[PDB]
Design a protein around this ligand. Structure first.
Ligand SMILES: Cc1cc2nc3c(=O)[nH]c(=O)nc-3n(C[C@H](O)[C@H](O)[C@H](O)COP(=O)(O)OP(=O)(O)OC[C@H]3O[C@@H](n4cnc5c(N)ncnc54)[C@H](O)[C@@H]3O)c2cc1C
Ligand SMILES: Cc1cc2nc3c(=O)[nH]c(=O)nc-3n(C[C@H](O)[C@H](O)[C@H](O)COP(=O)(O)OP(=O)(O)OC[C@H]3O[C@@H](n4cnc5c(N)ncnc54)[C@H](O)[C@@H]3O)c2cc1C
Ligand SMILES: O=c1ccn([C@@H]2O[C@H](COP(=O)(O)OP(=O)(O)O[C@H]3O[C@H](CO)[C@H](O)[C@H](O)[C@H]3O)[C@@H](O)[C@H]2O)c(=O)[nH]1
Ligand SMILES: O=c1ccn([C@@H]2O[C@H](COP(=O)(O)OP(=O)(O)O[C@H]3O[C@H](CO)[C@H](O)[C@H](O)[C@H]3O)[C@@H](O)[C@H]2O)c(=O)[nH]1
Ligand code: NA
Ligand code: NA
Lengths: 386, 386
C-alpha cells in the first residue's frame, strides 16, 4: 500500500510516532498537517530583518532527566550547552530568580546565610499553616510569607490566569519555591540545551526518512474519508483537538491562549538576558523574551545594532485563538472524562489512537510528549501494525 | 638503559612532557618528585572527617579555548559540566560578580539597561583618562569610576598584593572590567569543567604508563650525580626553581605566597556557593572557598551536616613558604634575564631543559603549562631524544 499508518499532526508527539514506525518497523507513514510547516508549536523560524531565530508559538526550552528521551533526540540534532536562567523585574529592580539567597539578599536588604535564610522563611511564613490554606494566595503565604508573595507571585499569577489568586486552588502550589543557596539554574533536569541549528531543522530531520510522506496545509477532517478508503486497515494516530474530533458533542473544552507582540529594536541589546519576568501589575505582559540571547554562540551572524524582542500576554482562548494550556475546571474535567470514553470506543471500532497535547487535553513539555509517543509506539502501535 | 629521559617535578608541565615521551616516542622516563605525591600544586585529596575533595595548594579551576589541550586532557580524565561563578561580599551584601548589569543594579540601586549602563560607566569614569593614569588606582578609576573602584577593587587588591594600589603599575589593568549584560560566567573560555574523579586521579592517570617510573620523596639535587652517571646521554627536563638550580648566584627571585586556613563546620552549607570574595579591608582573607559546591554531583556522598571551608590569605613568600606567584619587580626581571642566559648555557652543555612555573619564573594556568610542555616536546625533545 502507499501508506501503512496515518499520523494527524506533526508536533513532537506525531513526529516521534511516525519516525519510530518508519525506522523501527519499516512501515510507510503518511503525516497530515494542517499548518504550512512541520513541528507544531515547537517550530521556529528566522525573523526576516535580522535573521535571528524566533518563535511564533512560545519560546521553547529543552530539558529532561529521561535518558532514553535524551539519547533519542540527539539522533536528530545536536544541542548547545545553553542553560536557562530567568530574572524578575519588580519595582524597578531586576532580581535574581527563582527565589534563593540572591533574591533574598536583594529584597530583604542584606546577606543571609543558608541557615539564616531558612530561619527567615520560617518567620515570614509562620502566619498560615499550609494544612489550613483554602486557596492559592493562602497556600503561597503559608510557604514563603506575605512580602515575598506580594512582590513576586501575586500579580504575575493574576496576569497569567486572569483571576484573583484568592480564587485559585491551594493545590496549584505543591512545594517550597525557595532555594537556600545561590544556584539560579532555572531548570533542575540532568540534560538541557537548545538545538544547534534551530528547532525547524531538528523537527524536519525527524520527518526526513525514506518511509515518511508529509502533506502540509491539509486538514484531516477534509481528507480523511478519501485517505482511509485507499487503505482501510491502516491505523490512525490523531493528535488534533479531542473535542473537535467528536463534533463538540459533549461541549467545548476550555483553554488559555497567549498573544505575542514581537518587535525589532534599533539596539544590539535590549535587556542583556534571554527572559525578563515582569512581576508588577502595571505591566500588562508577563515577560519579555530577547531571542538573540538564546543563541550566544551565533553572535557573529546576529546584527550588531538590532535585536528582536517579544512581549507575552495571557488570556482565555476564544474562537480563532490558538489553544495552548488546558484550563481544567471541574466542568472541563467531566466533559474530558466523557470524551475519553468516546475516544476509547473509537480506538476499538476505527483503529484511531489519541495522543499529544490536543488529543488528550493535557499540557506536555517536549520531552514528555516524546516519552508519551514512545510509550504509545511500544505498547499499542507495534501490535496494531503487525 | 633503565631510563632515556629524566623529568624533575611532577606538576602538569612535567607530567605532560613525561607522558608524551613515554607514549609518542616509546621512551623510558624517570620522574623525580620532591613531595610525597604527584601533580604539583594541582593535586587534591579527601578531607579525612568529611570525605570532601579539597586542595592544599589553592583551588584549581580548569578552563581553556585551546582545543588541542582540551582533547589531550580528556584522554586522562572526563570533566564535569561545572561552570565557575563568583560572588563579592561588600558591606554586608553578596553582589553578583564580575561587574555587570547585576552588580550595577544592586550597587546603584535600580535596573540599568545595557545602553544605560554604558552611559553610567562613561559618566562615572569621566574623571581620569586612561592615557593619563600613572598607577593602578588611577587606571582603575579611569575605567570604572571611584564608587565601583573603592567598593570592589581597592581593598581586595591591597590585601592580595600587600601594597597600596597607588603604588602599583597602571599596566596591571588592561581592559574594561565591566560587562553590559547579565552574564556572570566567571571564565570566558570555550571549554571548562572539573575532573570527574578529582585531580589526584587525573594526574595519577597521566603518569600511569608502562614506560614511566615515578620516584616520590626525592630531591633532584640530592640524587642527580648518581642518576646521570647511570646514563649520561639522557636529557633532563627540570621544572624546579630556576634560581635555586644555579645556587642563587644571581640573587633570590621574589615570590608571593598564600596561607590557607581550612575548617570543618557543623553545618551542611556555609555560604551556598563555591567561592565568596571578601572585598572589604576589615576581613583579613581575600576569599572563602566551600569545597563541596565544586562537586554538586557528589551530594549524596557528602555529609548532610558538615562542610569544609577555607580562608585564603596573601603575603610575601619568606624562607620556608611555598612560592606561588612571581612578583616581577624590575629587580626580579633583571636577575631573571641573567638566569635565562645561565639556563640556555646549561641546555647546551648539559642537555638540561628548563620549563614550568618554577623553572621559568612565570605563573602558568594548567592549560598554559600543558601547552608549553607540548611545545617543548614538539620543538626540542623529539630531536634531543633521537
Ligand atoms: C506557549 C508554549 C510554550 C511551550 N514551551 C515549551 C518549553 O519551553 N519546553 C518544552 O519542553 N515544551 C514546551 N511547550 C510544549 C511543546 O510545544 C510540545 O512539543 C507540545 O506540547 C507537544 O505536544 P504535541 O506534539 O501533541 O502538540 P502540537 O505541538 O500542538 O502539535 C499538534 C499538531 O497537530 C496539528 N493539527 C491539529 N489539528 C489538525 C488537523 N485537523 N489536521 C491536521 N493537523 C492538525 C497542529 O497544526 C500541530 O502542528 C510549549 C508549548 C506552548 C504552547
Ligand atoms: C595558588 C594556586 C592556584 C592555582 N589555581 C589554578 C586554577 O584555578 N586554574 C589553573 O588552570 N591553574 C591554576 N594554578 C596553576 C597550576 O598549579 C598549574 O598546574 C601549575 O602552575 C603548572 O606549572 P608546573 O607544572 O611547572 O608547576 P608545579 O605544579 O609547581 O609542579 C612543580 C613540581 O616540581 C616539584 N619539584 C620542585 N623542586 C624539585 C626538586 N628539587 N626535585 C624534585 N621535584 C621538585 C614540586 O614539588 C612540584 O610537584 C594555580 C596555581 C597556584 C599556585
Ligand atoms: O515570576 C514568577 C514566575 C512564576 N510564578 C508562578 O509560577 C507559575 C508558573 O510559572 P511560569 O508559567 O512562568 O513558568 P514554568 O516554570 O511553569 O514553565 C516555563 O517553562 C516551560 C518549559 O518547561 C514553558 O516554557 C513555560 O511556558 C514556561 O512558563 C505562575 O503561574 C505563577 O503562579 C510566579 O508567581 N512568579
Ligand atoms: O573581587 C575582586 C576580584 C579581583 N580583583 C582584581 O583582579 C585581580 C586578580 O583577581 P583574582 O586573583 O582574584 O582572580 P583571577 O581572575 O586573576 O584568577 C583566578 O583564577 C585562576 C584560574 O585561572 C586562579 O584560580 C587564581 O588563583 C584565581 O584568582 C586582583 O588582584 C584585583 O586587582 C578585584 O579587584 N576584586
Ligand atoms: Na506556614
Ligand atoms: Na576615563
Amino acid at each position: 500500500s502507499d501508506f501503512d499508518l496515518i499520523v494527524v499532526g506533526s508536533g513532537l508527539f506525531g513526529l516521534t510516532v511516525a519516525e519510530r514506525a518508519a525506522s523501527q518497523l519499516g512501515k510507510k507513514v503518511l503525516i497530515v498537517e494542517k499548518r504550512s510547516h512541520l513541528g507544531g508549536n515547537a517550530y521556529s523560524e528566522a525573523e526576516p530583518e535580522t535573521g535571528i531565530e524566533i518563535h511564533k508559538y512560545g519560546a521553547h526550552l529543552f530539558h529532561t532527566s529521561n535518558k532514553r528521551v535524551w539519547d533519542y533526540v540527539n539522533q536528530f540534532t545536536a544541542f548547545t550547552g545553553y542553560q536557562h536562567r530567568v530574572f524578575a523585574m519588580h519595582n524597578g529592580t531586576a532580581y535574581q530568580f527563582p527565589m534563593g539567597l540572591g533574591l533574598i539578599n536583594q529584597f530583604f536588604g542584606r546577606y543571609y546565610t543558608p541557615d539564616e535564610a531558612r530561619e527567615l522563611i520560617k518567620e515570614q511564613s509562620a502566619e498560615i499553616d499550609s494544612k489550613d490554606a483554602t486557596n492559592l494566595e493562602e497556600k503561597a503565604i503559608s510557604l514563603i510569607g506575605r512580602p515575598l508573595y506580594e512582590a513576586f507571585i501575586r500579580d504575575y499569577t493574576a496576569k497569567q490566569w486572569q483571576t484573583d489568586p484568592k480564587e485559585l486552588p491551594a493545590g496549584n502550589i505543591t512545594r517550597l519555591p525557595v532555594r537556600y543557596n545561590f544556584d539560579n539554574r532555572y531548570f533542575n533536569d540532568t540534560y538541557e540545551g537548545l538545538p544547534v541549528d534551530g528547532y525547524a531543522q531538528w523537527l524536519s530531520n525527524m520527518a526526513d526518512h525514506e518511509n515518511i510522506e508529509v502533506r502540509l496545509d491539509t486538514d484531516w477532517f477534509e481528507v480523511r474519508e478519501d485517505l482511509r478508503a485507499q487503505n482501510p486497515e491502516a491505523p490512525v494516530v490523531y493528535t488534533g483537538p479531542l473535542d473537535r474530533y467528536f463534533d463538540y458533542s459533549e461541549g467545548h473544552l476550555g483553554w488559555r491562549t497567549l498573544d505575542f507582540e514581537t518587535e525589532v529594536l534599533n539596539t544590539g541589546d535590549f535587556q542583556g538576558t534571554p527572559v525578563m519576568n515582569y512581576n508588577d501589575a502595571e505591566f500588562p505582559y508577563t515577560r519579555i523574551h530577547e531571542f538573540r540571547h538564546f543563541h550566544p554562540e551565533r553572535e557573529d551572524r546576529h546584527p550588531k545594532d538590532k535585536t528582536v524582542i517579544m512581549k507575552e500576554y495571557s488570556r482565555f482562548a476564544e474562537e480563532g485563538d490558538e489553544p495552548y494550556y488546558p484550563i481544567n475546571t471541574p466542568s472541563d474535567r467531566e466533559m474530558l472524562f466523557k470524551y475519553r470514553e468516546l475516544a476509547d470506543a473509537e480506538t476499538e471500532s476505527g483503529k484511531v489512537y489519541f495522543g499529544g497535547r490536543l488529543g488528550t487535553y493535557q499540557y506536555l513539555d517536549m520531552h514528555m510528549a516524546i516519552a508519551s509517543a514512545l510509550s504509545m509506539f511500544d505498547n499499542k502501535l507495534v501490535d496494531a501494525l503487525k
